Amino acid sequence: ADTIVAVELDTYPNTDIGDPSYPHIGIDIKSVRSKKTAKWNMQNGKVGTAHIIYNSVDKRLSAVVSYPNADSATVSYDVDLDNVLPEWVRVGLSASTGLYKETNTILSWSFTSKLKSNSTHETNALHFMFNQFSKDQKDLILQGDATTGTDGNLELTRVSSNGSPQGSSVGRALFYAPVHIWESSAVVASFEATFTFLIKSPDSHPADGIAFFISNIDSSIPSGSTGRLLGLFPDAN
Amino acid sequence: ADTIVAVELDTYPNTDIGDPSYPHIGIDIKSVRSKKTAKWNMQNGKVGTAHIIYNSVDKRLSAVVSYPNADSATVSYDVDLDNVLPEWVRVGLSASTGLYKETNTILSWSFTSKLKSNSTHETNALHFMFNQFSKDQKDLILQGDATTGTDGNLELTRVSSNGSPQGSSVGRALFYAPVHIWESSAVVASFEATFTFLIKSPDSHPADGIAFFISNIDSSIPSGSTGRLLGLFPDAN
Amino acid sequence: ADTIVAVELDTYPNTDIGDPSYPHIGIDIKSVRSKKTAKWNMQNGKVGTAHIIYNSVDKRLSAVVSYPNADSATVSYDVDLDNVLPEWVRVGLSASTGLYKETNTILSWSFTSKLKSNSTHETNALHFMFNQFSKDQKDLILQGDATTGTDGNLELTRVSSNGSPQGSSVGRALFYAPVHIWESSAVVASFEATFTFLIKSPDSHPADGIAFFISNIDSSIPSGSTGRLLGLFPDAN
Amino acid sequence: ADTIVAVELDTYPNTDIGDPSYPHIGIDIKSVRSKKTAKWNMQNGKVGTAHIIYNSVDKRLSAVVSYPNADSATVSYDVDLDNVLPEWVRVGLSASTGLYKETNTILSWSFTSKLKSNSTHETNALHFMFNQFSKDQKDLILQGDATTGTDGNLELTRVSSNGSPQGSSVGRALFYAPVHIWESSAVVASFEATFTFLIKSPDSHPADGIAFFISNIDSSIPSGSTGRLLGLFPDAN
């Protein structure tokens, strides 16, 4: 059903479905079994930053994850997204917890998309930036357990009053307007996404992760996609 | 019903409903009878450019209209939009023809909106730019006779195959995502809009005009708003 | 000699040279005696933010100063800068201490300038943003005691090893490239500046202030402009 | 002496110094003998557009050249610029004519550079855009025969009154401020450059080309670099 391309920040090693034995970042092209991963030194309770970049000339989707005063993790994959996704997509953030849990908090999110035509001085662009939310964030579609406005933050999975992360929770937030990622006359198409997140768990093995994704416009949370399937995939294939 | 703030480029003088005796640009706060106007030297068949700017510190909505190698027309009005509009709005372009007519073509449109909070490094922003359209422009809501894709342009009123403008036509295009123009913690809110247009009429008295507007999110074309009411107002009050 | 337009954040009341009896923000057009002031509730040791905006249609220079979780101070002045400044200027930050002192630290600085011509799709723009400095910041001209690189910050007045502010100190930082603020064919010219600052003083009466300024390109610190003259004016006239 | 990285649009085939037998675009890393080329279908008298992009995660410098209603030419090269260039550079445009000639006119030029640190919300950016020039363009360093202001255009090689291109001419324009392309704490560094150009020659074999380049800050035109050496290299090695 849904066409998903995602960059995941996966905190729990489900080695049975192909994860490496550590926290890792990965690029998922239509399956939870990442096409490419890298070890990520996840820091419990610290704000991190993820940068995702792509352009139609190189056809390389790359991601860099960093924490203050630390070395970065980075992963890249050669993929032409014109052959994977529809030309109109929606972009969003998704997260889950399963038996083990964590808060999946989003403190800011920006995205830029550009289509540069072969006509002179002809650029089509979309850009949004959220450094603060609203309880009534009318330009986000919130799905599952995601809520906005808690300390001006976006909470992708259920967090109870006392600040505790809840298990078996899944939530997603997608920007309202469709995003145009191809047009026939375009010489270069590019996008850039950045988000900062706070993953805090009282456990020694937090789970499950955060993912930035791009899907077909009508995408909704697949049934049973809590825990390891990150709110993105119906199964582990 | 709808809350409309608009900057109009009015090509026909309906002096009976308060227009001056010439083409003019004006600022309409909830009524077709402009709060402020200026003479506009309309050029038939030339591409013009309109720039509209506003910010919450000055509370002045100003507009500048220019044509290549010509002097500009400019109009300004002191108005606090937090006291006129809802905090979530949609923005768009509207046009009509009546007994006299003209093509109301839009060749590009950009908009930027910014909410800067009192928190440090906290800006929320939306920015779109259309230098080219699509027949299937999924991030625009097209109403009435507006169509996209004709020479990559947006045609706000009906134009027949041979390029001729049709009379009694009204059309509007609004960007899909709601726009947030106030929040409680904001120290400055601003927006900026620019569009280029081509008004071509085979008549000596073209009618009726183009307007950039900001309305409540569910705004739709009022019944009977062709001709002088620009697709914006239900009546001439 | 130098042509100075500045927005000052003045921490010490030199009522003898016209200050009000409190910390205040003011707009100086070629003299230290502000054309317009507003009371500013200065917070010792907190990071504040200043936003300065101007455009050639309204001809209003306005400034908003805020601290987290506090109400803002704002001041505005009707002034046409085409009649005060040359068309090529440099922009910068300046600060001083006198007998009383304070740290004048700059943690980030961004500026944008735009000249929009009457020709279609013709915008000339300059934009810089510094969220971090360098010991060797080659695109800043540092004058007097200003230094860069101390905790990635810009220190406009002398601070000794142990973190203490020094008295009788004056420093300025200007961006390297000239800025073009008028051209004959421009229909709208605008600029926007933002900076965050930390004023920390161990005294109950800190002095003297920070100012954002725009000057002629070859401007340098006037002789004797420590203390109340903010590194900007040769005298108190 | 100078460290040059350039993307050239080479109109004349000097097959003796390694050019292919056709107009071509190429990536030069410190030598006129391109590391990589692609056939370019040069159109005499038409305005073209060049887009150059690079980022420190992929380490791929790519360029796309297009003309209206035509197919694009594109060339890419894997190169880590931190190992080739200094961390402070200047960027510019260069062109030459030799025995055969052409006008090398620049109608617009924009550049963006970004350094994103591992600190949260810490981006340093420079952005300029020239859609129009000035006879007194004080933020460009013009070298050799380059002049500004002729029809608001930048003329990189000598053009005489009647509009004719002159032979044996070389000129360069560099933006005034140094550009910072690396810093120790940066997780991603990127830049983007775009320019539109008009190459018009009354000859059947125009020469020599236009190049976008990045050099050390004090770079100046090497002696004898007219014709095939594009104003960039001292020799053909």
From Swiss-Prot, chains A, B, C, D:
This is Concanavalin-A, 2nd part. A carbohydrate binds at residues 208, 228. Ca(2+) binds at residue 208. It comes from the Eukaryota.
